Design a protein around this motif. Structure first.
Motif, PDB file in Angstrom:
ATOM      1  N   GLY A   1      -0.415  78.961  40.286  1.00 29.49           N
ATOM      2  CA  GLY A   1      -0.638  78.789  41.709  1.00 29.49           C
ATOM      3  C   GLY A   1      -1.958  78.114  42.029  1.00 29.49           C
ATOM      4  N   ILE A   2      -2.241  78.000  43.323  1.00 24.97           N
ATOM      5  CA  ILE A   2      -3.430  77.314  43.813  1.00 24.97           C
ATOM      6  C   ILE A   2      -4.727  78.009  43.385  1.00 24.97           C
ATOM      7  CG2 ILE A   2      -3.704  78.487  46.053  1.00 24.97           C
ATOM      8  CD1 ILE A   2      -4.129  75.672  47.280  1.00 24.97           C
ATOM      9  N   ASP A   3      -4.652  79.315  43.145  1.00 26.91           N
ATOM     10  CA  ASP A   3      -5.841  80.103  42.845  1.00 26.91           C
ATOM     11  C   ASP A   3      -5.560  81.133  41.761  1.00 26.91           C
ATOM     12  OD1 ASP A   3      -8.159  82.101  44.870  1.00 26.91           O
ATOM     13  OD2 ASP A   3      -8.164  81.597  42.744  1.00 26.91           O
ATOM     14  N   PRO A   4      -5.676  80.704  40.506  1.00 32.88           N
ATOM     15  CA  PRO A   4      -5.479  81.563  39.342  1.00 32.88           C
ATOM     16  C   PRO A   4      -6.422  82.760  39.315  1.00 32.88           C
ATOM     17  CG  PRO A   4      -5.474  79.276  38.687  1.00 32.88           C
ATOM     18  CD  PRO A   4      -5.910  79.301  40.124  1.00 32.88           C
ATOM     19  N   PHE A   5      -7.636  82.621  39.836  1.00 30.86           N
ATOM     20  CA  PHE A   5      -8.578  83.732  39.768  1.00 30.86           C
ATOM     21  C   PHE A   5      -8.092  84.880  40.631  1.00 30.86           C
ATOM     22  CE2 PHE A   5     -11.182  79.905  39.095  1.00 30.86           C
ATOM     23  CZ  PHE A   5     -11.695  80.206  37.844  1.00 30.86           C
ATOM     24  N   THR A   6      -7.634  84.560  41.831  1.00 34.85           N
ATOM     25  CA  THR A   6      -7.123  85.586  42.722  1.00 34.85           C
ATOM     26  C   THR A   6      -5.832  86.209  42.201  1.00 34.85           C
ATOM     27  OG1 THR A   6      -8.231  84.656  44.643  1.00 34.85           O
ATOM     28  CG2 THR A   6      -6.351  86.108  45.065  1.00 34.85           C
ATOM     29  N   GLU A   7      -4.947  85.400  41.617  1.00 34.80           N
ATOM     30  CA  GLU A   7      -3.721  85.942  41.037  1.00 34.80           C
ATOM     31  C   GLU A   7      -4.049  86.986  39.979  1.00 34.80           C
ATOM     32  OE1 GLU A   7      -0.546  83.090  39.939  1.00 34.80           O
ATOM     33  OE2 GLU A   7      -1.996  81.555  40.564  1.00 34.80           O
TER      34      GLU A   7
END
Length: 137
Positions: A1-7
């Motif tokens: 997704g757009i933001d792997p860190f948040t996932e």
């Protein structure tokens, strides 16, 4: 997704909450020297609400503790055999002492999913992030 860190962060937090609730049930069974259960209230999804306490006739009449469910949106925590409850005993083991495997997934896909295991001895462990579930169950 757009933001792997948040996932990764959201899956990590959810796995930690489930870990905390399971550890609490186990530690209470050991402390109280009696069978303490933990029950998934909805969909056999351990991220949608939990009750912890003395189980009788399929219900926990007077929960010692409750969990309101994961905070992030698209998460599920399902066990390999679709258990709806687990019962820890005084020596820390589950009855029955069957190995349990929880898949914590986002959006029903195993990408970046996490595995929380319970050994035959009843020990609960969040598996390293390199280990993804085989299925979201």
């Amino acid at each position: 997704g757009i933001d792997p860190f948040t996932e990764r962060n959201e899956l990590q937090s959810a796995a930690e909450e489930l870990n905390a609730m399971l550890q609490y049930a186990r530690s209470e069974a050991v402390s109280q020297r009696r069978a303490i259960s933990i029950q998934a209230l909805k969909d056999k999804d351990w991220g949608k609400g939990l009750s912890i306490g003395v189980l009788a006739s399929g219900s926990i009449a007077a929960p010692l503790r409750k969990h309101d469910g994961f905070r992030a949106a698209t998460l599920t925590a399902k066990e390999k055999s679709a258990v709806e409850h687990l019962t820890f005993t005084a020596n820390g083991t589950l009855v029955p002492p069957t190995e349990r495997t929880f898949a914590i997934c986002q959006n029903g896909k195993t990408d970046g999913g996490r595995v929380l295991s319970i050994s035959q001895a009843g020990r609960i462990q969040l598996e390293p992030s390199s280990k993804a579930p085989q299925s979201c169950y």
